[PDB]
Amino acid sequence: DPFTMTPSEDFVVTDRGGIVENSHRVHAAVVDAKGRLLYALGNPTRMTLARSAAKPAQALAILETEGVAGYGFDDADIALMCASHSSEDRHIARTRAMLSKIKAEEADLRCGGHPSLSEMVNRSWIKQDFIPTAVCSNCSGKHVGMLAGARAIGAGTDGYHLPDHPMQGRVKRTVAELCDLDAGDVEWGTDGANLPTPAFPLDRLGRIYAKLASAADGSDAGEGQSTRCAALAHIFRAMARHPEMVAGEGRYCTMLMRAFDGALVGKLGADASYAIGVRASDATRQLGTDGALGISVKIEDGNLEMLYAVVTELLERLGIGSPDVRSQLASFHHPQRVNTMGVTTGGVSFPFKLRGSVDDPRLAAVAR
Amino acid sequence: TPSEDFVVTDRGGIVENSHRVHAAVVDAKGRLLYALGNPTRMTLARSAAKPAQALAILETEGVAGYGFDDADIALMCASHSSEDRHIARTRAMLSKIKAEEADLRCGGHPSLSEMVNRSWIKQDFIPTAVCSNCSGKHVGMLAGARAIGAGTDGYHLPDHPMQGRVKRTVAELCDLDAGDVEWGTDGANLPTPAFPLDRLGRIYAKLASAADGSDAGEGQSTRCAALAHIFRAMARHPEMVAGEGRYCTMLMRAFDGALVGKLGADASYAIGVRASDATRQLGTDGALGISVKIEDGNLEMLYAVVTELLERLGIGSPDVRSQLASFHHPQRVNTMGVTTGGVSFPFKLRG
């Protein structure tokens, strides 16, 4: 029944010859630069672990640490602070170069190695029986930045990753401020790189990225900016200018940001969250706002392949990009379902319904 | 109305992911005894259908003369890890029917075992037909095609008499009309069935009930004798059904003949349990079947949920189920060795 559809029915579905295989619940928030909710799927205020999608906020805490500017980190270094990189040789090399800029060593890192986020890098490692180390961590740029901040303020570098260290105090305050939340409304766990990692309502992730894009708009327009806005604009520019540092070859975040050529930044969070900050455009004005826009997405069950398909579908429904721009992402939008003998067996579909654009006022949209 | 039954992962007590669970526990006639979620969800059984496909093979006139043994039949029932021993038995079965790898109509794929696949990657190995996790099923279907003098070139096609026999056998074991079983195509390019989840449990209840009847000396039909043989082969050679470290293998070794279990791709699972003190305590005088589907397809959550279900149902002892402890509560340890989270089962079995 099309007239009683509900957020609880916002799904992405795979089929085999039209027979339902798996279904996945979708949550999404589309917000303006003040965080006002414009469109939604599912529960747009779902309490959600932002995971690596919080990295631009952590990079802001690093860059706002007094004395860090003296080290001379460049745009590509800042993009690596914002990264879940593929541990390609260039990412490892830049990690070592950043360590040298602050006169630190690999032994000072408090993150550990892991199989590469890229299948192609991991195959190269498997062939050589290579055991990844701390400098290979996908979070290595963030950790070097945290070490840099600890050094700059005269804190111990031992324990820079611990919650009671001033660098983590700065991270926690900065995240809550960008979300416009009280501290008690942000919850904290520990991530794979052994750092505090925040959870907050999903729409506030979109809000962080709308603020990134809004700051970039203000910088480009030559507006006088606060130190924080200037730093957010710098983070946006660094990500857009060096998207290969943010992920790597063949990675969604990199291909997305290259396709859009400065129009937006995007960032993956582990267990299938995603965030995009969109500079003001004809597309954002058609969506009903006079400034920048933020988008955040969570697949409830954590499936990454479905995440990238949904994010690409959502950009199409929001009219962001062109068919030609979004077509660089076609392999993510409709994932291949080809069996071992080259026969297509099924596909992906998107039975979810954006709300916010309509319906009988008696139709309740219960966030679920 | 189906309950809202979930398995939930957390990071420091904060919800990470949640996964909807469907499950059916049925008696030997398929009557529903316990459920999670929607126990009749229309579900692609995928490889959990392989014992029914093995039955169609074993019931084919002339197949007995090839001399397939228990380990061969276990391989027909397998989603194996493509270990060297699985490939070697595939080749040995091809030799029994005087066929070649080129006669197979399945293709190679990365191993279901990450350890095997890493070993292949290190050695630049390109898997071929004989490495398919379904290779034993395909040899069996080739064997059946040969046995009745049908063409072998298209034994995998829907209009071939081997697939006619498979389709009829699946619906008969489900106790469904032909029109109530839907069909797609699987990764190995064979027809693969969808039917209500509880009927998958019914198939495995019939497997275990047949083993109970053969064990007790009852006048069994030929079909029941064949089902008992399939159960015996899987429980005797569980390493052929999956492989080292695989859930199905560790599950069946732990239970030492008390049950058989089988994975279906995209996170279905089926178990047939022979009558026991545990099944009698559950209120049935015969064998039992269990089938599970994780709605979003997550395998790690599947194995955690199945093990939690065995615990709720009292199936096995604590000591026996502790062999599956690593699947029941999967590791959540970061790159520096710190535990960051866990898994929870806020569902409740309804009876």
Residue numbers in the entry:
A (entry chain A): -3 to 353, 357 to 367
B (entry chain B): 2 to 352
Q: What did the paper state?
A:
Asparaginases (EC 3.5.1.1), which split L-asparagine to L-aspartate and ammonia, are grouped into three unrelated structural classes: Class 1 (bacterial-type), Class 2 (plant-type), and Class 3 (Rhizobium etli-type). ReAV is a homodimer with an α/β protomeric fold, formed by two tightly packed domains. The active site of the enzyme is located in a cleft on the protomer surface and marked by a zinc ion with an unusual coordination sphere created by Cys135, Lys138, Cys189, and a water molecule. The conspicuous catalytic center of the enzyme comprises two Ser-Lys tandems (Ser48-Lys51 and Ser80-Lys263), centered around the curiously hydrated Ser48 residue and located in the close vicinity of the metal binding site.
As in the structure with the C135A mutation, the absence of Cys189 triggered a collapse of the metal coordination site and the C189A mutant protein is unable to bind the Zn2+ cation, as also corroborated by microcalorimetric titration of this protein with zinc. The mutation induced slight atomic shifts and structural rearrangements in the active site area, but these changes are not strictly equivalent in the two subunits of the dimer. Alternative conformers of Cys135 were found in protein chain B, where the major rotamer with refined occupancy of 0.8 retained its typical conformation and points to the Nζ atom of Lys51, while the minor rotamer is rotated toward the Oγ atom of Ser133. The hydration pattern of Ser48 is similar as in the WT protein, with a water triad centered around the Ser48 hydroxyl group. The pattern of H-bonds at the two lysine residues, Lys51 and Lys263, is practically the same as in the WT protein. Only one conformer of Asp187 is visible in the electron density maps, but intriguingly, its side chain points to the main chain N atoms of Ala189, Asn190 and Leu191, and not toward the side chain of Arg47, as observed in the previously described C135A and H139A mutant structures. The position of the sulfate ion is slightly shifted compared to its position in the D187A mutant structure, where the sulfate ion is bound right next to the water from the metal coordination sphere. As in the case of the C135A and K138A variants lacking the metal cation, the mutation affected the oxidative state of Cys249, which is not oxidized.
